Nucleic acid binder design. Structure first.
Length: 114
DNA sequence: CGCGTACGTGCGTTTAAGCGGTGCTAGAGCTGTCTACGACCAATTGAGCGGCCTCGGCACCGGGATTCTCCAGGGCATCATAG
């Protein structure tokens, strides 16, 4: 579960935040040959060293290609960052982040990399 | 083969052409003279002609540059699809 080197705007200067089970770094994949879907989605929380100053990285596209990405900055509070992260994970998977352990692949939603 | 417009057809309106006359006069046409211009003619001579050279512009030949034609693609943007 390494920080993406492809995030040039953020590589080098920060360390991804995790907590045991709850790892706020993850890559999800969805393949579906019926509809020719083959897409991935990485999410990464990064902390500043000086202050409690966090950033949420999202990156998604067809497998292999960087496609598109978004940076939502959360210098305000890390809890906001958890909100964005967990809410988006639910939106995208229909699984809660606290209950991420018992993942059940519903059709047309992301699964993660074991 | 399709499409669109402009000319033919037909019909009604206007106006000067045609017609017929009258009248006027410019100039066409005729006639008579006479002169100057061209025919004519003979002699003269030089301008022009045939002949004869002759040199430089042109024909030819070759060779290379440029242009014209031509085709193959360098490369690169439209489009479908992703996420």
């Amino acid at each position: 579960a390494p920080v993406d080197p492809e995030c040039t705007a953020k590589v080098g200067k920060a360390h991804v935040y995790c907590e045991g089970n709850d790892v706020y770094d993850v890559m999800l994949n969805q393949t579906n040959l019926q509809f020719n879907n083959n897409k991935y989605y990485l999410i990464q929380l990064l902390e500043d060293d000086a202050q409690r100053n966090f950033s949420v990285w999202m990156r998604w596209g067809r497998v292999g290609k960087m496609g598109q990405h978004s940076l939502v900055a959360c210098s305000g509070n890390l809890n906001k960052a958890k909100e964005i992260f967990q809410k988006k994970f639910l939106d995208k998977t229909k699984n809660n982040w606290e209950d991420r352990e018992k993942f059940e692949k519903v059709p047309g939603k992301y699964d993660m990399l074991q």
